[PDB]
Amino acid sequence: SHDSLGKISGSPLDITAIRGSFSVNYRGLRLSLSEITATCTGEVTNVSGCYSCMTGAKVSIKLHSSKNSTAHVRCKGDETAFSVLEGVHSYTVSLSFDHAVVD
Amino acid sequence: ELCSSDSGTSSGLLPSDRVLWIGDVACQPMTPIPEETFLELKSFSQSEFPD
Amino acid sequence: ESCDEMVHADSKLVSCRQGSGNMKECVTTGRALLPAVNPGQEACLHFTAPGS
Amino acid sequence: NGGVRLITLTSELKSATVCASHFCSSATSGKKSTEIQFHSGSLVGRTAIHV
Ligand SMILES: *[C@@H]1O[C@H](CO)[C@@H](O)[C@H](O)[C@H]1NC(C)=O
Numbered sequence: 001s002h003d004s005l006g007k008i009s010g011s012p013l014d015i016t017a018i019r020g021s022f023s024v025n026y027r028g029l030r031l032s033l034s035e036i037t038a039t040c041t042g043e044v045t046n047v048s049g050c051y052s053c054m055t056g057a058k059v060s061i062k063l064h065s066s067k068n069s070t071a072h073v074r075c076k077g078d079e080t081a082f083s084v085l086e087g088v089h090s091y092t093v094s095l096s097f098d099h100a101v102v103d
Numbered sequence: 104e105l106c107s108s109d110s111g112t113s114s115g116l117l118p119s120d121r122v123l124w125i126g127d128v129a130c131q132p133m134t135p136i137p138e139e140t141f142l143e144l145k146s147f148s149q150s151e152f153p154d
Numbered sequence: 155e156s157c158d159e160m161v162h163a164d165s166k167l168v169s170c171r172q173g174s175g176n177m178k179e180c181v182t183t184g185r186a187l188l189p190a191v192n193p194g195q196e197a198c199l200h201f202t203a204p205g206s
Numbered sequence: 207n208g209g210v211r212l213i214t215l216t217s218e219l220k221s222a223t224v225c226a227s228h229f230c231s232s233a234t235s236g237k238k239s240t241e242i243q244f245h246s247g248s249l250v251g252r253t254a255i256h257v
């Protein structure tokens with residue numbers, strides 16, 4: 001495998017390992033916050049994907065606001081967060097559903 | 104605290120042992136850095152010393 | 155792309171100040187855990203502030 | 207396939223009117239993605255939508 005700091009790799013057949021969770025620790029960092037968020041409203045445009053599967057179901061969401069990126073989508077079944085840009089643009093995100101007719 | 108009178112300092116020529124440099128520090132040419140990196144380093148330093 | 159597996163382990167854990175005049179932050183320290191994901195995914199770490 | 211669809215991003219849709227080559231329509235519900243249809247197969251050809 002072409003990669004830095006190591007050129008040895010290998011992959012057997014589908015293993016489906018038990019767990020591969022990570023561990024993140026923080027010591028010090030800065031982050032700027034605007035706290036000047038204004039009225040913003042979006043809507044759903046398209047929806048497609050698989051059933052409850054690997055790639056999931058991708059849903060396109062369109063927003064329109066003056067702030068660069070201030071959004072947090074929360075719903076039952078699955079929670080998805082993403083970043084947007086200034087103005088009106090198109091964004092595609094994926095969620096996890098457990099029903100064929102998603103209504 | 105104060106500069107007291109000294110007879111040995113009347114000649115105007117003082118030896119090198121009367122000069123003390125507090126701490127061992129050396130300098131070198133530097134390179135300007137952006138303010139974001141400096142602020143991040145300051146935040147990390149103030150987080151590493153909470154007392 | 156998409157994101158999943160939210161944590162929100164250390165929300166509202168800041169001790170900042172007026173923040174350079176209008177709004178700024180100083181530091182955020184804590185500890186969280188990210189579960190395993192499929193190759194080609196994104197694990198987002200959303201922070202929450204009491205003021206913002 | 208059924209008709210045209212109006213998309214609003216600033217706020218909800220209070221009321222709007224659409225125009226076609228030889229027909230017109232007007233409908234509102236108050237949501238973001240609203241659908242407006244004129245008839246069954248009335249728009250056949252090259253026309254311009256003026257909302
Ligand atoms: C939404 O409509 C179809 C549905 O799949 C899609 O092909 C199209 O690209 C989407 N619209 C935009 C503006 O991307």
Ligand SMILES: *[C@@H]1O[C@H](CO)[C@@H](O)[C@H](O)[C@H]1NC(C)=O
Pocket residue numbers: 034068086
């Ligand atoms: C928003 O994005 C633009 C372009 O990427 C940048 O110039 C501007 O500084 C950003 N504003 C904030 C508050 O991040």
